[PDB]
Design a protein around this ligand. Sequence first.
Ligand SMILES: *[C@@H]1O[C@H](CO)[C@@H](O[C@@H]2O[C@H](CO)[C@@H](O[C@@H]3O[C@H](CO)[C@@H](O)[C@H](O[C@H]4O[C@H](CO)[C@@H](O)[C@H](O)[C@@H]4O[C@H]4O[C@H](CO)[C@@H](O)[C@H](O)[C@@H]4O)[C@@H]3O)[C@H](O)[C@H]2NC(C)=O)[C@H](O)[C@H]1NC(C)=O
Ligand SMILES: *[C@@H]1O[C@H](CO)[C@@H](O[C@@H]2O[C@H](CO)[C@@H](O[C@@H]3O[C@H](CO)[C@@H](O)[C@H](O[C@H]4O[C@H](CO)[C@@H](O)[C@H](O)[C@@H]4O[C@H]4O[C@H](CO)[C@@H](O)[C@H](O)[C@@H]4O)[C@@H]3O)[C@H](O)[C@H]2NC(C)=O)[C@H](O)[C@H]1NC(C)=O
Lengths: 106, 103
Amino acid sequence: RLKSSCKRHPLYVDFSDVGWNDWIVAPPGYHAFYCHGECPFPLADHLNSTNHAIVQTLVNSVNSKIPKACCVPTELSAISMLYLDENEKVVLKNYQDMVVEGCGCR
Amino acid sequence: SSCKRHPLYVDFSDVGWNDWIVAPPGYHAFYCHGECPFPLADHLNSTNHAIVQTLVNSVNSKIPKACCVPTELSAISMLYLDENEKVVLKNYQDMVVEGCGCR
Ligand SMILES: *[C@@H]1O[C@H](CO)[C@@H](O[C@@H]2O[C@H](CO)[C@@H](O[C@@H]3O[C@H](CO)[C@@H](O)[C@H](O[C@H]4O[C@H](CO)[C@@H](O)[C@H](O)[C@@H]4O[C@H]4O[C@H](CO)[C@@H](O)[C@H](O)[C@@H]4O)[C@@H]3O)[C@H](O)[C@H]2NC(C)=O)[C@H](O)[C@H]1NC(C)=O
Ligand SMILES: *[C@@H]1O[C@H](CO)[C@@H](O[C@@H]2O[C@H](CO)[C@@H](O[C@@H]3O[C@H](CO)[C@@H](O)[C@H](O[C@H]4O[C@H](CO)[C@@H](O)[C@H](O)[C@@H]4O[C@H]4O[C@H](CO)[C@@H](O)[C@H](O)[C@@H]4O)[C@@H]3O)[C@H](O)[C@H]2NC(C)=O)[C@H](O)[C@H]1NC(C)=O
C-alpha cells in the first residue's frame, strides 16, 4: 500500500459486474482508468494543479485538519455506447467524460 | 452531509507568505468538504466517470470513491515584493473556489 505521487492507474470496468449490462447493449466494458496518489507539500506545477490546490496543501502543513489536494481526473475523454429505446430501436449515444486522460492534484 | 463549499480564510502571516506578499493580508479561499454518496444523486456537479468509480467502489474497495474537489475557480489580485524590492501588482488565477463537485 506504499505511498506514491498522484498518477493514472489502469481500470477495466465490465458492466456486468456493476449490473449496467441490463441497459447498455455495447460495449461489454471499457478502460476507465482512475486517479490515485499523494499530492505532496509543496506541490509541483507538473502535478496538473491549481493555485488553490498549492494554497490548500500549504494550509494543511500548518493545520492538518484541512485536507491536502485530492488526486483527481483533470482531463477526460468520451466513449460511444449503444442502448435500446422504448420501441426496441438501437440508439448510439456519445458519453462525455468517461475515460481518464490525465490526473492532477486539486 | 455531502460535498459542498466551506469557508477558509487564508492568512499569509500564519502561512509564512507575509515576507513576499504585501497585500491583501489574506483572502477568502474556500474549500470543498463532504461525502460523495452511493449511488451519486443529482445537484453534485459530478462527471460520468465519478458515477462509474463510485459504483465500482461499492463492488471493489481497492478502487476509491470520488473526491470532493473545486469545479469552478475565480482569480484574485495581489501585491508582492520582487527580487529588486519593487512592489508589483499581479493577477493569480484559480485562487477562490466558486463551486464543488464529485470527481
Ligand atoms: C497531466 O495531464 C496531462 C494531460 O492529460 C497528462 O498527459 C497526457 O497523457 C495521456 C497518456 O497517459 C495522453 O493521451 C494520449 O495521447 C496520445 C496522442 O498521440 C495517444 O497516443 C494516446 O492514445 C491511447 O490511449 C488512450 C487512453 O488514454 C486511448 O483513447 C487510445 O485508444 C490509445 O490507446 C493505446 O494504448 C492503450 C493502453 O491502455 C491500448 O489499450 C490501446 O488500444 C492503444 O494501444 C492517448 O490519447 C496525452 O497525450 C497527454 N498529454 C500531454 C500534453 O502530455 C499527464 O500525464 C498528467 N499528469 C499526471 C500526473 O497524471
Ligand atoms: C455546483 O457548481 C456550481 C457552479 O460553480 C455552484 O454554483 C455557483 O455557486 C456560486 C458560489 O455561491 C455562485 O457564485 C456567486 O454568484 C453570486 C451571484 O449569484 C455572487 O454574489 C458571488 O460573488 C460573491 O462571492 C464570491 C466567492 O464565491 C466572492 O469572491 C465575491 O467577492 C462576492 O462576494 C459577495 O458574497 C460574499 C459572501 O461569501 C461577501 O463577503 C461579499 O460582501 C459579497 O456580498 C458568487 O460568485 C454561482 O452563482 C453558482 N452558479 C450557478 C449556475 O448556480 C454550485 O454551488 C455547486 N454545488 C456545490 C455543492 O458546490
